């Protein structure tokens, strides 16, 4: 499947579901990190 | 009188500049507001059983 960007979509990633707007990030992940969260415990960013 | 007035103003400026207690009351209100919001949101993570 493809990646639809810069608009609200329904998403289903490898263990993460919901809706939202997908955009490229500059977040620096570690070699052993899958996804990140905000100060409040909600998904912020996801590794494809 | 004019001299004393002028001096006092300069005095206040330095007093405010080098202190950390001035306007503590305003900071307090802001802090309280933030705490209320932080508490509200944090509890979203509660299972409640």
Taking the alpha carbons of A40, A41, A42, A47 in that order, is the dihedral positive or negative?
positive
Q: Give the resolution value in Å.
A: 4.5
Residues of A in contact with B42 (CB under 8 A): 40
Q: Which of A48, A27, A24 is nearest to A38 (CA)?
A: A27
By the 8 A CB rule, do A18 and A1 touch? no
Is the separation of the CB atoms in A46 and A19 below 8 Å? no
The residues near A11 (Cβ < 8 Å, ≥ 6 apart) are A17, A18, A19, A20, A22
Question: Which of B37, B41, B46 would best serve as a mutation to test chain A binding (most A beta carbons within 10 A)?
Answer: B41
- Rg of chain B over Cα atoms, rounded to whole angstroms, equals 21
- Chain A touched by B40 (CB under 8 Å): no
Report the structure determination method: cryo-EM
Task: Tell me the chain A residues in contact with residue B45 when contact means C-beta distances shorter than 8 Å.
Answer: 40-41
């Amino acid at each position: 499947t493809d990646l639809i960007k810069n608009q609200c979509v329904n998403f289903n990633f490898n263990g993460l579901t919901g809706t939202g707007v997908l955009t490229p990030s500059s977040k620096r992940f570690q070699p052993f990190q899958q996804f990140g969260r905000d100060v409040s415990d909600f998904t912020d960013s996801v590794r494809d | 009188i004019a001299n004393q007035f002028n001096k006092a103003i300069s005095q206040i400026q330095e007093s405010l500049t080098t202190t950390s207690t001035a306007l503590g009351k305003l900071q307090d209100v802001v802090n309280q507001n933030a705490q209320a919001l932080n508490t509200l949101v944090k509890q979203l993570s509660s299972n409640f059983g």
